[PDB]
Amino acid sequence: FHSFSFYELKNVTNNFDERPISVGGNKMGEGGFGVVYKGYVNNTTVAVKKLATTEELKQQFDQEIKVMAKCQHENLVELLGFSSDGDDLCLVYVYMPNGSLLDRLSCLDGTPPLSWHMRCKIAQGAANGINFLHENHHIHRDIKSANILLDEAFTAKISDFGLARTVMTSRIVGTTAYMAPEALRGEITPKSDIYSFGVVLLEIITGLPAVDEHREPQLLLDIKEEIEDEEKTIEDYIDKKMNDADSTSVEAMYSVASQCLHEKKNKRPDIKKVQQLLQEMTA
């Protein structure tokens, strides 16, 4: 990949501005131990991930390059270049005009609700990205709606490979509301990625965030339990900000999410079965 100067990126990101795009800054957010900044290089808008323990922060940079050097797919964010010459380590990506699936499900900044048709295409696209990672023996470890990006055509692009990668670990990492029971205990398995994807499918169907502090229940994965103990159905949870959803395809996506959400890691389907099921739903 392209080797950029730290000052070339510092110039295009206005000395790494930590303010939002809406006010007059460059910051896009923060996640996998790095801050995303909006820039403009080689006549194109870019995403700049400034990384930024002192050695642990460096390992987060070397992992993402090694995984992406191997990883080239239509459902993964494209790494254009990088920077190592400066104090902070940087990663350059293609700018995703439609931001995250999280922000689009919440209609952040007044954007129109995504239709069921777009939501199906996004689910299928995201599953194809995970499949590519799993085929190439990689575990994402942070599958969530904020890590699913959308391009100029609303194509799903999996981002953030800082945490990428059955093993055990003392450093438990990921997002609680999306985490499988075993991943919360320290296990490292691609079966944890399937569980997290089941939470994403529940967000797609319902339009509700995985965690909402002012909601009952606070965690979206607990809504799956309320439906199983037939107090309610998936139909009662369908996002109301849609006009094109039908019961058949919604129930078909919910079944996939339910299978993904088995608490027993070995009962869950593998990514290739997830793709098959999502493809049959459309078709």
Ligand SMILES: CCCNc1ncc(-c2nc3ccccc3s2)c(N[C@@H]2C[C@H](CO)[C@@H](O)[C@H]2O)n1
């Ligand atoms: C309003 C237009 C937004 N456009 C946009 N385009 C590319 C990225 C990349 N972010 C990353 C992160 C890791 C690897 C590649 C990329 S490409 C991004 N990230 C922010 C920040 C956060 C991730 O930390 C996400 O949920 C997004 O909101 N936002």
